[PDB]
Amino acid sequence: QSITAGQKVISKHKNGRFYQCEVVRLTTETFYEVNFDDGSFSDNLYPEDIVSQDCLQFGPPAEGEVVQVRWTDGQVYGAKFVASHPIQMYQVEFEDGSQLVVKRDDVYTLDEELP
């Protein structure tokens, strides 16, 4: 069930197919959740995407705090901070040297059927 660093596993390469890869490292990724001013919700902002304060340096905003966020379209939007969410993830390396950081559910052990 648990995956450890140094373990050969199976996961999708960037080209979209399953290959054997090796777990390089277990990382922790912190995601921010915010409610935009129009009421739309985001669950996977990075701390650096908050542009009204320096969260990389001083941690997350207070729950409910007004913020501005730089969105994936490069534009800035008004929002309110909802929650911060650390997630255990797996940095994997493929045969060709390419790497990805993936979630537990996207990793398979060598003995298991690929769905």
Numbering used by the authors: 897 to 1011
Which of the paper's sentences describe this entry?
KDM4 (JMJD2) is a conserved iron (II)-dependent jumonji-domain demethylase subfamily that is essential during development. Vertebrate KDM4A–C proteins contain a conserved double tudor domain (DTD) and a potential zinc-finger domain at the carboxy terminus. From our biochemical and structural profiling, we find KDM4A, KDM4B and KDM4C DTDs display different histone-binding preferences. We show that these DTDs use an aromatic cage as a general mechanism to coordinate trimethyl lysine and, most importantly, the sequence specificity is largely determined by side-chain interactions with surrounding residues.
In all the structures, KDM4A-DTD forms two lobes (HTD-1 and HTD-2; HTD, hybrid tudor domain) with interweaving β-strands. KDM4A-DTD, which displayed strong binding to H3K23me3 as well, also bound H3K4me3 and H4K20me3, consistent with previous findings. KDM4A-DTD binds H3K23me3 peptide at low micromolar affinity (Kd=2.2 μM), slightly stronger than its interaction with H3K4me3 and H4K20me3, and KDM4C-DTD displayed highly specific binding to H3K4me3 (Kd=6.8 μM).
